[PDB]
Amino acid sequence: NIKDLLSQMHHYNAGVKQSALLGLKDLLSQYPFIIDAHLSNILSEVTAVFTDKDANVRLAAVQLLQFLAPKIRAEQISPFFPLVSAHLSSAMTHITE
């Protein structure tokens, strides 16, 4: 379920997460109702770091954000905009190009 996938996202191993994101997008694609049930938690985990150490990890997160963006349409995402920009600003203003 989702709670299993949420645990797979916070796992220490980076390769463990890679299987989760691919399976995640398939699950919400089958059931759009997964979106509104737990909107707060899904956004927090994917937006948590926004700067991995392997290139494809962000790409999988970006493709998840590519797929997840059409469903969420404002209101709910409005107050975590400072939150996402916090990880965004730190990553843009970072030593590594």
Place this chain on the structure above:
Amino acid sequence: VFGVICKLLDHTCVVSETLLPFLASCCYSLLYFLLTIEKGEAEHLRKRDKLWGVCVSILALLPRVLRLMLQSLRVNRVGPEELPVVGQLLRLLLQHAPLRTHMLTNAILVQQIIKNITTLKSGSVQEQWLTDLHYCFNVYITG
């Protein structure tokens, strides 16, 4: 009367224990009316949203009545005629986000009823309203 308690509660309220069992009984029976509209009489159709709004607000403000209401809603004492009615209500209250944490604390009570509904309806047809019941519980909140 449902409106008064919805519009009078404060942190200093000393709500009596002799009135809570009365309120829970009066709430579900009114809730039963909304579900069995079955069209028919056109008069008893416009008076749906108003009753539904005040009915839902009474459980949000009173955590205890929700437990009292769900402590009596069970099976093995009512025929299968009312089973679609209770099944629709139980799955519907899982929606309406204002009442998530209230149902979260009463997960055990709701879970026991879930098995009961599936229990007597073992050898039967799919009954889509029952198929959605299991998935919606696991989808809209954790299992």
